[PDB]
Amino acid sequence: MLEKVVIANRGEIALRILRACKELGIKTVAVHSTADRDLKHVLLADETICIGPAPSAKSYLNIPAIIAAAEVTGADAIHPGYGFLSENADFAEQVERSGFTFIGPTADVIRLMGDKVSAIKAMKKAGVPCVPGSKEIAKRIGYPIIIRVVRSEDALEESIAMTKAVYMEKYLENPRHVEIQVLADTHGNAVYLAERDCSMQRRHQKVVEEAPAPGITEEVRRDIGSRCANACVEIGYRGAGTFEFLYENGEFYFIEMNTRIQVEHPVTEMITGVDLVKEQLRIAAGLPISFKQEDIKVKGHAMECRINAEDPKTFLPSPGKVNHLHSPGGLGVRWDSHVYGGYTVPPHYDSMIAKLITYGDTREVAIRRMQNALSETIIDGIKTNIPLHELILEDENFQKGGTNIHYLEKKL
C-alpha cells in the first residue's frame, strides 16, 4: 500500500494532506521552495526536500525536481493538492511512467476533462446536462449567446470576426454556481456527496462557499448526483472530483469537472461526515470507497470563508509578518490554516492564509457561528479580507440565500 507520500503543494492544502497522511500512518515528504522553509507542514513533515527557488515556475511547477524528490526518498505516491500541477496530465503521466502512484485520476481522464470540448461531449454522452450550444445556431440557442457576449443577431457576424481574431452556447444571465462532489474507486464504485453553492465570487474567484445548496431538494440532489456518479464510471474516473454547474431556473448546466480535490471540500466533510482527503489516499492505494451511497445523508449546514491576506476594499495582496494570530474555536468551528503567530506571508503565491469553516443544525446557525468566529479572529501585521466576509454574512439577500454569481460584484 501507500507508505510514503510526496506532498507536491504548499500552504493550507499541504497541511491538510499531511494531517490525513499522519492519521493513516503514512510517511510524508514535503517538497518546498526556498521561500517556504517555515511553512507549518514543512516543519511537521517526516522528510523535507527543497525543490527550487521562490517562483512557482522553478519550484512547485518543476516536474523533474518533484519526481526526483519521490525517487530519492523512495516514496510511493505523490499528492498534487489543488492548483499547480494537479490538473496537469503531462505531470500525471510522468509520475505513473516513473513508477509512482499519482493521487488523482489517470492522465488520460485528466486530459479528457481538461479540454473544454471533449469534457462536454463526454458529459452529454453520459447524460450529464450541459449548456445548450455547439448561422442559425445562435437563433436555435436563444440570445444572449457567447463566442464576446452577443445580445443581438445583427451583431453576430461582426462579433464572431472579433473573437476569431470559436463556438457558441447559452449565456445564463444570473445563475448560481452549484457543484457536486464525487468519489470513484478502482472497484467500480462511484458516489456523490451532495453539493456546494459557491456563488459568492469576485472575478470568478470564490470567496464564500456553503453546503448543502439552499433550495435544492433531496430528489433533485439524487437526480443530478446520480448522473455525476454514472459519468464517473463511464469515463473511468478515479479519486475525488467535482462536477461544476451553472444553476438557473431549476436547471443544471455543466461547465467544468475539477479532476482533483477542491479548496472548499471541507463544507462537504462537515455535512456528510466523510474525510475526503483520506478517501483520496485510500482510493489511490487501491481500496474501495469506505462507504456506500445509502450511507450518506446530508445533516445540518456548513459554510466556509476564505481568509486572504489582501486589502478588503482594493483586494491588493498584503504580504508580511503576522505579528499576532488569534484563531477562533468552540463548537461547530473549524480552522484550516498553516499560518501561525510570527509567520511571514510571502508574495510569491496566492493570498490564502486560512479557511474558516462553520457547521450548524441549520443554515442560520452556521451563518451566526461564522459571524461570531470572524469577530474573535485577530490577524495583526497584515490586512485581511475579514471585513468583506462580515459584509457578506450580514447581507439580507445572502441571509435569505440563493444569490447569483454576479451578486457580490453587484454589491460592492
Place this chain on the structure above:
Amino acid sequence: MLEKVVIANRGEIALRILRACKELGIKTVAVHSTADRDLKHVLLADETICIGPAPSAKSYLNIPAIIAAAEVTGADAIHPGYGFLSENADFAEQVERSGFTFIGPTADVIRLMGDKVSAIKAMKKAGVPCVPGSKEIAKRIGYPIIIRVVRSEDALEESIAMTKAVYMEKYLENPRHVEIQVLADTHGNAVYLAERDCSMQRRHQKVVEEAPAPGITEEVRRDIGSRCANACVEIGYRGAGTFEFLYENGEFYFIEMNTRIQVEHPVTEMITGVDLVKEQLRIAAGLPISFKQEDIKVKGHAMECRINAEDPKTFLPSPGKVNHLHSPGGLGVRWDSHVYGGYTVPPHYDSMIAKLITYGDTREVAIRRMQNALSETIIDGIKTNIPLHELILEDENFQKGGTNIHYLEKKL
C-alpha cells in the same frame, strides 16, 4: 425571554458561555476580577464589570458583587458555569429572590443533591442504582468497606473510632468513572445524552475524557439513561446535569450528581450533535428541550485532553506569559480555549488553559487525531501537561480501552 446574561465565571467556560449567548443574540455581562481584565471573553463581552481583587474569595465567590452586577446592568439571568458558585444553593436562592433567572436547577434541588446523604436517598427512591452501604453492616456489604478504608473486620471497630474523631459502603477496588449527561426542562421533559468515561484521573482530578464509554452497549445505555431521566422528573430537575457512576463488573453505582454543566461536556456535543450550553440558556428561558429522546443517536467517538499550565512530571503550576501559541485545527479537531499569544496565565485560579477535543468515526480515529493535534500544538513560555497526554494516548491499555480510575496513578 433572556435578553442579557451575567457570566459569573472566567477562563474557558466563560468564553464557552459567551459564544452560546452571542449565537442566540443574548447580551453578555462579563464580571471579572482585577487579574482577569485581559481574559478573551472579557474583551469580547458587551458589558464588563470588575467585581473585586484577584483572590476568588473576594471576586468570583463574591455573591453580593455578582448580584449587584446583574442589578446595575439590568440583566435577566446569571450563568454560574462550573466550579465557584455553580453548586452553591445559597447563591441560587439569592439570585432568584433578587428576581433574576439562575441558569441551573432550583436552589432546593441543588441542596438536595448537595448532601451526599439526601442525594443517595433520592436516587434510591428514583430507581437509580447506588453503592451498597447505609455492627454486622460491614458483613452484609462485604469487605473492603469505607467509613478510612477497612479491609478486615477485626479492625472495623478501631477504624470507626479513628474516623468518628460516619457511614459505610462498598469499596470498589478498580471501577471506571462513567457519567450520564442529562437535560430537563420546565415542560416535564428529561433526556439522556449517552455517557462519558472519565477514568483517566490523578488525585480524583480528570485529565482525559471520552464519549461514548467503551464496552457500553446501547441496551445498557438506554437502561441507565432512562433511570437518570426519570430521576430528573422525580426530583424536579431543571437544566443540564450529570449523574456520575462508578462502573465495575458491568454494574453502575451512583456517587454524585453534578447539578451544573461539566468541563467535559464537549465530548457529548460531538457525538450527539447537541449544543449543551445553548440548551441551558433555552431551558432557563422557559423553552422545551429542542429535541426528543428518539432524536438522539450516538455517532462516532470523541475525546478530550485538558491542557494545563503545569509541569508534566511534578504537576506544580506554571503561570506566566504565553510567548507563542499555536493551536491545532483541521477536520475533527475542536479547540476550546481563552488563551492567546501574549496572554499571561495568572496564579490565582485553576491551571486549565485549553480543552483539545477530537472526534472521529471510531475511537481509533479520535485517538490518532488527538495525537496528531497535540504534536502540532505549541505553547511556549510556560510548561504544560501535553507530554502527559502523549504518554496516555500511546498507552497500550488506553488504546484497548476500559482502564480504571486508579490506572493513571498506577502508571506514572
